[PDB]
Structure 1
Amino acid sequence: DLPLDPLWEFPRDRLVLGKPLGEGQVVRAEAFGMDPARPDQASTVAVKMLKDNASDKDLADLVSEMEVMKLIGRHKNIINLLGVCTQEGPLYVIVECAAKGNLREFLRARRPPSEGPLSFPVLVSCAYQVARGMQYLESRKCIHRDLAARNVLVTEDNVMKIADFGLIDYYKKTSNGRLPVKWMAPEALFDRVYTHQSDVWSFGILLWEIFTLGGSPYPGIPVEELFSLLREGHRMDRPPHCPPELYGLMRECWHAAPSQRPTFKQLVEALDKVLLAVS
Structure 2
Amino acid sequence: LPLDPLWEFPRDRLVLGKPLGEGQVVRAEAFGMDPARPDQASTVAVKMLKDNASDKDLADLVSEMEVMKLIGRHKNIINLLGVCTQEGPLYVIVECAAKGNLREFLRARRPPPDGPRSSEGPLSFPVLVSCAYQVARGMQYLESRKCIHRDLAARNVLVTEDNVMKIADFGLARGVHHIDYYKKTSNGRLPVKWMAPEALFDEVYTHQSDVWSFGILLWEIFTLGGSPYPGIPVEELFSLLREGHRMDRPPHCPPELYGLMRECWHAAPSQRPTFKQLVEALDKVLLAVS
TM over 0.5: yes
Distance 1:57 1:224 in 2: 31
**How many pairs align?**
278
**When the two structures are superposed, what TM-score results if normalisation uses the length of structure 2?**
0.93
CA shift, 1:43, in A, is 0.5
Distance 1:228 1:54, change over 3 A: closer
Deviations 1:97-121 (A, max 9, x none): 1000000000000011299221110
**More displaced stretch, 13-22 vs 219-228:** 219-228
Q: Trace 1:1-279 onto structure 2 (pairs within 5 A).
A: 2-113=1-112, 116-167=121-172, 169-279=180-290
Distance 1:175 1:123 in 2: 27
User: Contact 2:64 / 2:171 at 8 angstroms: preserved in 1?
Assistant: yes
CA shift, 1:169, in A, is 4.2
CA shift, 1:56, in A, is 2.4
Secondary structure at the counterpart of residue 26 of structure 1: strand
CA shift, 1:89, in A, is 1.5
User: Contact 2:182 / 2:234 at 8 angstroms: preserved in 1?
Assistant: no
Distance 2:52 2:135 in 1: 36
**More displaced stretch, 127-136 vs 234-243:** 234-243
Contiguous gaps of at least 5 residues in structure 1: none
Secondary structure at the counterpart of residue 238 of structure 2: helix
| Displacement over 4 Å in runs of 4+ | none
Deviations 1:56-113 (A, max 9, x none): 2222111111001001111110011100011121111101110000000000000112
CA shift, 1:170, in A, is 4.0
**More displaced stretch, 123-132 vs 171-180:** 171-180
Distance 1:58 1:225 in 2: 33
Q: What is the percentage of aligned positions where both structures have the same residue?
A: 99
CA shift, 1:37, in A, is 4.1
Deviations 1:223-264 (A, max 9, x none): 222122211111111111100110110010000000000000
Contiguous gaps of at least 5 residues in structure 2: 115-120, 173-178
CA shift, 1:219, in A, is 1.0
User: Contact 2:111 / 2:123 at 8 angstroms: preserved in 1?
Assistant: no
Distance 2:279 2:271 in 1: 17
Deviations 1:141-182 (A, max 9, x none): 111111000110000111000011111544310011100111
Distance 1:114 1:108 in 2: 21
Secondary structure at the counterpart of residue 269 of structure 1: helix
**More displaced stretch, 157-166 vs 35-44:** 35-44
CA shift, 1:220, in A, is 1.4
**When the two structures are superposed, what TM-score results if normalisation uses the length of structure 1?**
0.96
**More displaced stretch, 54-63 vs 79-88:** 54-63
Distance 1:243 1:55, change over 3 A: same
Deviations 1:168-221 (A, max 9, x none): 544310011100111111111111111100000000000000000001111112
Distance 1:114 1:269 in 2: 40
Secondary structure at the counterpart of residue 39 of structure 1: coil
**More displaced stretch, 169-178 vs 97-106:** 169-178
Distance 2:276 2:37 in 1: 35
User: Contact 2:29 / 2:44 at 8 angstroms: preserved in 1?
Assistant: yes
CA shift, 1:5, in A, is 0.3
Distance 1:172 1:272, change over 3 A: same
**More displaced stretch, 159-168 vs 5-14:** 159-168
User: Contact 2:181 / 2:234 at 8 angstroms: preserved in 1?
Assistant: no
Distance 2:203 2:221 in 1: 27
CA shift, 1:18, in A, is 1.1
Distance 1:174 1:53 in 2: 19
Distance 1:114 1:229, change over 3 A: farther
Distance 1:239 1:90 in 2: 46
Distance 1:247 1:182, change over 3 A: same
